[PDB]
Amino acid sequence: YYDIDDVLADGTEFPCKFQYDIPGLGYLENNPGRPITKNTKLSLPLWLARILAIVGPVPFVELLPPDMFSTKVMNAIKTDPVALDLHSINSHFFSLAIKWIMLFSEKELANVVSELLLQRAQELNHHASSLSIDLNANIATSTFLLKLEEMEKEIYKKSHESYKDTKRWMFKK
C-alpha cells in the first residue's frame, strides 16, 4: 500500500469496454461532459479498471485482453526468455502479470511466467556473480541490464551488493 513500485504498477492503462449507458462520464473519455455509450472502447488505469470490472449481473466494464499478454509475446517468451527484452514490453511486467493472474484464476500464464522468471534469474545470478578486477591497480553485462524489469533490477542490485560486500570482506588487507 505504501510501496512506490506497486503504486506505479497500478497506474498502467488497460483496454476496457463499457457495458452500460452512463451519462456524465466523459472525463474518462477524451472529451469532457458528454455521455458515454455502451460498447465504447477506451483505456483506463488499473486502479479504476479493476474495481469497475468486478463491481457493477452484467458488470460496468469488461477487461479486454492486453497487448502485454498476447500470443506473440507468449511465443517470444517461450522461444527465448533470456534474449527477450521485457522492458520495452513493460517496466512492471511481473507485477502486472501477477495481478492479472490473481484477477482471472488462470494457470497457463502462471506456468509461462514462472518458467520465464526462472530462466531469467539464472542469467541474472550469473551477471551478479561476475565481478570486475583491477589488473593495472562489460558489454554483455550492460546489454542484459538494459533488458531488465524493475523487480529484476531490484533483485540484481541486492545480489550484486551482497557479492561485492562478501568479496570486499574476504580480500580486505
Binding site: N75, K78, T79, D80, A83, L84, S88
Partner: protein
C-alpha cells in the same frame, strides 16, 4: 538410420497438424483442376516447438541435418495424397520435391546484415534489410535425361552444387553424358530434363538503423525455383534462410594470400514483403462511412503533418497528388498522365523540407533525392555488369525505381543543367531513353514529382517579377501542375501562434519514457484527426477501386473558370496555358477520388478551381 527416424518424426508432426495436409491437398486440387502454385508449405515454428522441442531446436541450430528429412516427409505425404490417373512423361521424369517454408518467432536468430557474424554460420536466421542489387534470372541444371535408341531405355544423371543442397556433396561438372555404360550412344532429352531458376540478390542494412559514423553493410542471398522474382531493388524484405560458407577460402595452395577468409551467403527459404496493407471488412466499412462525410477533404488534409502549422492549401495539394488522377492513353497514340506535380518556392524556414519528409514517409512508394547529391545517370539508369552472369545490363535510377510512385527532390535549384535535362525528359515523356554500350531500350518512369526550391536571392522579393525571382527554366516550370509561393511574413498574431505550436510540439514525450531519458521483432510471418495508418488504408482503397469519369456540369464549371482566369487583367504568379485546363481536370478527378465517387461533380470542379486560383493569385 537417424535420417529415417527424423523423417518418421516429421511425418508424425505433419499428421498431428492437419492444416498443412489440407493446404497440400488444396494446392494439388488447384493444380489438377487447371496459373500453378509452387510446391511450398509454410509451417509455424511455434507449433513445431509445442509438438517436439528437439526437432524445433535442431531445425533452428542445425538446419542442414533436420530440413532435408522434413522436406522428404512432406514430399512422401504429398505423393501418397496424389491420385493423378495418368502421369505425363515429363511429370515422371520431373524432379520437383516439395520445399519447406518457415514462419513464427526466431528468438535470437532474428538479425540484420550488420549483426551476422561467424557464430551464426550453419544456422537458420532471419535477415531484414533493403534490396540494392538483383542478378538476372538464369536456369540451372539439376537432372539430365538421356535416351539409348538400341537399348530403348532412358538413362538419367543427377547434378549438385554448393548452393542447391544444404549438405555438402562431391562436385559434379555439367558435362552431359555422351555414352552408355556398355558404349551405347546417348541422345539428350531436353524436354524431359529438369532445370530450375537461379538468382542472387544483395540485401542491405537499413541506413536509419546503422551505427554512428559507419556505412551500412550488406549480405548476399540466393533464391531458387519459385522465389526467383519475388523482389525488386528498393524493396524492404524479411528473408529467412540458412547462413552458409562456400569455397576453399584460401586453404588451397593456389591462393598465397593466407589472409583471406571464406565466402558467405544465405540460401533463402522465404521472402516476406514489408508495402500494401491488407484491408478488412471493418476497415472498408469505416472508409466508406468516413468518406460519406461532407467535409472529408478538410479532415484528410488536416490529418497530414499535424506538427506543421498552417499550409492548408499545400496539404490539400499533397493529398490530391497522393490520390492522383486517372491516366488515359488514346488510340491515336497521345498519352495523358494522371500524376500531379507540385513545386514550392519560398523563404528559408517555411517547412518545405519537413513536408517533403512527411510525404516521403506517408506515400506507399517514395524516393528521396537532393539537388547536389544526384546526377543525370543516377536519376535515369546506370550501365553495369552482372556478377553472376557477366552480362551488360541496366541499373534502375531514382526515377525508374519510383515508377507508379513519388520522387521528392530537395534543393531543386541547386542542381546542374546536365542533371536537369534528365528530369525534363522524365516529366515531359514519363519514359527514359538509354543509348549506351549497345543498349537500346525505353524505361517506364511514371512518377509524381514534388520538389522544393529557393529564390535566387534567397528571399522572395515582391517588387521583382516572378521570372527574375526563380532561375529555373520556363519549360521545366510549365510541367509542374501547381506552383506554391510561400513567404515568411512577420505578424504578431501569427508569430505568437507559431511559437506556441512549436513550443507545444517540442514538449512531446514518447509513451513508456521517463523525463530526461534520451530516445533510443517478436514474430516474422505474422473535426477529429485521422490516424496515419487509416489514412494510408484510405489512400490505397481510393486509388485502387475508384476511377472517376467526367460529367457535363464539371466541364461547364472548368471551362468557365479557365475562360475567366486566362483573359483577366489581374496578374498571375504563373502564366496561364492550355496545360492549366489539364491541371484543372486532374485536380477535379483527384477530388472525385477523395470522395469515392464514380463521377466528377460540380463540387470537385469548384474545389479544383479554388485550389488553382489560390496557387496562382494567392
Amino acid at each position: 538410420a537417424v535420417f529415417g527416424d527424423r523423417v518418421r518424426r516429421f511425418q508424425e508432426f505433419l499428421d498431428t497438424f492437419t492444416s498443412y495436409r489440407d493446404s497440400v491437398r488444396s494446392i494439388q486440387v488447384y493444380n489438377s483442376n487447371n496459373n500453378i502454385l509452387p510446391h511450398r508449405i509454410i509451417i509455424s515454428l511455434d507449433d513445431l516447438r509445442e509438438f517436439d522441442r528437439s526437432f524445433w531446436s535442431g531445425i533452428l541450430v542445425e538446419p542442414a541435418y533436420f530440413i532435408p528429412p522434413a522436406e522428404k516427409a512432406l514430399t512422401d505425404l504429398a505423393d501418397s495424397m496424389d491420385d493423378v490417373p495418368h502421369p505425363n512423361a515429363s511429370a515422371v521424369s520431373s524432379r520437383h520435391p516439395w520445399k519447406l517454408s518457415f514462419k513464427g518467432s526466431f528468438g535470437a536468430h532474428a538479425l540484420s546484415p550488420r549483426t551476422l557474424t561467424a557464430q551464426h554460420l550453419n544456422k537458420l536466421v532471419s535477415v531484414e534489410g533493403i534490396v540494392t542489387k538483383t542478378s538476372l534470372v538464369r536456369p540451372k541444371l539439376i537432372r539430365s535425361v538421356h535416351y539409348a535408341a538400341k537399348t530403348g531405355r532412358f538413362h538419367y544423371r543427377d547434378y549438385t552444387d554448393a548452393t542447391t543442397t544444404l549438405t555438402t556433396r562431391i562436385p559434379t561438372p555439367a558435362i552431359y553424358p555422351t555414352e552408355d555404360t556398355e558404349g551405347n550412344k546417348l541422345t539428350t532429352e531436353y524436354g524431359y530434363s529438369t532445370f530450375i531458376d537461379h538468382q542472387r540478390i544483395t540485401v542491405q542494412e537499413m541506413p536509419e538503423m546503422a551505427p554512428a559514423g559507419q556505412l551500412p553493410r550488406s549480405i548476399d542471398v540466393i533464391l531458387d525455383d519459385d522465389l526467383v522474382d519475388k523482389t525488386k531493388p528498393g524493396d524492404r524484405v524479411n528473408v529467412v534462410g540458412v547462413f552458409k560458407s562456400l569455397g576453399a577460402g584460401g586453404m588451397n595452395q593456389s591462393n598465397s594470400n593466407t589472409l583471406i577468409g571464406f565466402k558467405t551467403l544465405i540460401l533463402g527459404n522465404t521472402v516476406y514483403p514489408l508495402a500494401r496493407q491488407m484491408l478488412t471488412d471493418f476497415d472498408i466499412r469505416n472508409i466508406n462511412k468516413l468518406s460519406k462525410k461532407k467535409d472529408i477533404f478538410d479532415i484528410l488534409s488536416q490529418s497530414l503533418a499535424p506538427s506543421i502549422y498552417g499550409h492548408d492549401h499545400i496539404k490539400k495539394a499533397i493529398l490530391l497528388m497522393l490520390m492522383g488522377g486517372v491516366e488515359k492513353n488514346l488510340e491515336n497514340g497521345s498519352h495523358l498522365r494522371g500524376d500531379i506535380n507540385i513545386l514550392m518556392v519560398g523563404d528559408p524556414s517555411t517547412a518545405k523540407s519537413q513536408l517533403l519528409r512527411f510525404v516521403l514517409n506517408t506515400a506507399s512508394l517514395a524516393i528521396a533525392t537532393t539537388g547536389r547529391g544526384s546526377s543525370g545517370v543516377g536519376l535515369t539508369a546506370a550501365v553495369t555488369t552482372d556478377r553472376e552472369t557477366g552480362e551488360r545490363r541496366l541499373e534502375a535510377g531514382a526515377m525508374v525505381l519510383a515508377d507508379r510512385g513519388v520522387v521528392c527532390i530537395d534543393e531543386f535549384d541547386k542542381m546542374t543543367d546536365v542533371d536537369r535535362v534528365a528530369i525534363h525528359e522524365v516529366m515531359e515523356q514519363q519514359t527514359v531513353t538509354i543509348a549506351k554500350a549497345g543498349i537500346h531500350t525505353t524505361l517506364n518512369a511514371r512518377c509524381s514529382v514534388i520538389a522544393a526550391a529557393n529564390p535566387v536571392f534567397g528571399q522572395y522579393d515582391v517588387n521583382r517579377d516572378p521570372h527574375q525571382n526563380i532561375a529555373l527554366p520556363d519549360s521545366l516550370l510549365s510541367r509542374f501542375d501547381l506552383l506554391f509561393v510561400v513567404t515568411d511574413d512577420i505578424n504578431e498574431i501569427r508569430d505568437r501562434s507559431i511559437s506556441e505550436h512549436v513550443l507545444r510540439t517540442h514538449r512531446y514525450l514518447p509513451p513508456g519514457y521517463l523525463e530526461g531519458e534520451p530516445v533510443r521483432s517478436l514474430a516474422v510471418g505474422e473535426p477529429k484527426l485521422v490516424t496515419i495508418p487509416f489514412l494510408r488504408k484510405y489512400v490505397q482503397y481510393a486509388k485502387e477501386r475508384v476511377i472517376p469519369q467526367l460529367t457535363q456540369e464539371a466541364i461547364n464549371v472548368i471551362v468557365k473558370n479557365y475562360t475567366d482566369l486566362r483573359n483577366d487583367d489581374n496578374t498571375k504568379k504563373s502564366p496561364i496555358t492550355a496545360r492549366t485546363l489539364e491541371t484543372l481536370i486532374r485536380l477535379a478527378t483527384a477530388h472525385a477520388k477523395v470522395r469515392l465517387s464514380k463521377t466528377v461533380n460540380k463540387v470537385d470542379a469548384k474545389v479544383a478551381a479554388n485550389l488553382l486560383r489560390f496557387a496562382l493569385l494567392g
